[PDB]
């Protein structure tokens, strides 16, 4: 097999990108220039949210909190969070450190390669084909498991900066903590106890936090290419840092919305698992990643899952009722994922 990274292909001098590349012609009528699409403030805006008084001792001001989160939760099901207590400098530093990881060369990056071929999951890779179309998407990652730290495989992180393991696990701690606050103020949001949501989703012990850097190279056709297709998330919550270059669309009301960037603030996604749970209350919007000529992208994504075998996932009971009956029949985390391919697959 060939082991082709995004970003040798963007440096190999390629004027034009390969077909594995390109969209087919349908998709391809929706994309259009990053940058341009950044600037249009026309249509509907993903919500910024203030999580500053989500745990205030102000009951009024509280409710207040909560109430524009469930609302932005049950509509757009994505937003921009806001003073959600995660230290600006901790941000900067996590950032930096990725930065840093792969401003090293792609040989070098190769000794941190994952083997999905042994179940080696972790690690520096590229998304494979999957399908018999062979769509590639322009895009290389870096994925490992962040959290519970007793979980974690450090000896797969990378060595380069020195302090990517000290920011990254300081990170995760703080994201797992508001996503305790988040759950809460959602659990509450539907008329449950606030600690239903995360119970649910394994709680402390079994929630897990995965943390994947993506890294989307210059694209000499950025209009042909997508850095990250179509799909939703799986996960319970994602909470998503960037450099700050455009590139994040969601599918709003039948049109792709671009979103904006919003300094200091952690894109926060409602994912399939929270949906299910909801009965499709809670939103896990269809999204997708544009790449561009000008600027090299990067995102960390942090996806807060459930364990894949160990919690039949469907819409609580308190969701269901004779007026209201399941939007989704019962499976797993994996059998969920799986299923997401067989339809495509097919
Ligand atoms: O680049 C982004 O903004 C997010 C990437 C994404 O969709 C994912 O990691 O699932």
Not at 130 to 137: D, H, I, K, P
Not at 311 to 333: D, G, N, Q, W, Y
Request: proline share 6%; charged share 30%.
């Amino acid at each position: 097999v060939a082991v082709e990274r995004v970003e040798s292909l963007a440096k190999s001098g390629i004027i034009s990108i390969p077909k594995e590349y390109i969209r087919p012609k349908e998709e391809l009528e929706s994309i259009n220039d990053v940058f341009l699409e950044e600037k249009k403030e026309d249509g509907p805006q993903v919500p910024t949210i203030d999580l500053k008084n989500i745990e205030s001792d102000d009951e009024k001001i509280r409710e207040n909190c909560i109430e524009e989160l469930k609302k932005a939760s049950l509509d757009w099901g994505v937003m921009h969070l806001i003073n959600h207590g995660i230290p600006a400098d901790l941000m900067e530093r996590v950032k930096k450190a990725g930065e840093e990881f792969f401003s090293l060369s792609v040989e070098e990056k190769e000794k941190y390669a994952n083997d999905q071929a042994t179940g080696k999951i972790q690690g520096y890779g590229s998304k494979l084909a999957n399908n018999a179309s062979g769509q590639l998407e322009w895009e290389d990652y870096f994925f490992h498991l962040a959290y519970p730290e007793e979980k974690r495989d450090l000896s797969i992180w990378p060595k380069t900066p020195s302090d990517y393991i000290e920011a990254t696990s300081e990170y995760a701690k703080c994201l797992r903590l508001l996503a305790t606050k988040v759950f809460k103020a959602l659990s509450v949001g539907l008329g449950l106890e606030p600690d239903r949501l995360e119970k649910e989703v394994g709680g402390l012990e079994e929630l897990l936090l995965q943390m994947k850097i993506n890294y989307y190279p210059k694209c000499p056709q950025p209009e042909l290419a997508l850095g990250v297709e179509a799909h939703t998330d799986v996960s319970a919550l994602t909470f998503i840092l960037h450099n700050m270059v455009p590139g994040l669309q969601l599918f709003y009301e039948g049109k792709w919305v671009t979103a904006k960037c919003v300094p200091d603030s952690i894109v926060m996604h409602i994912g399939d698992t929270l949906e299910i749970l909801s009965n499709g209350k809670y939103k896990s919007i269809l999204h997708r990643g544009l790449v561009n000529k000008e600027k090299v992208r990067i995102s960390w994504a942090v996806f807060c899952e459930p364990p894949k075998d160990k919690i039949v996932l469907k819409p609580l009971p308190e969701m269901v009722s004779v007026e209201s009956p399941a939007k989704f029949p019962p499976r797993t985390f994996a059998q969920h994922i799986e299923h997401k391919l067989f339809g495509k697959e097919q």
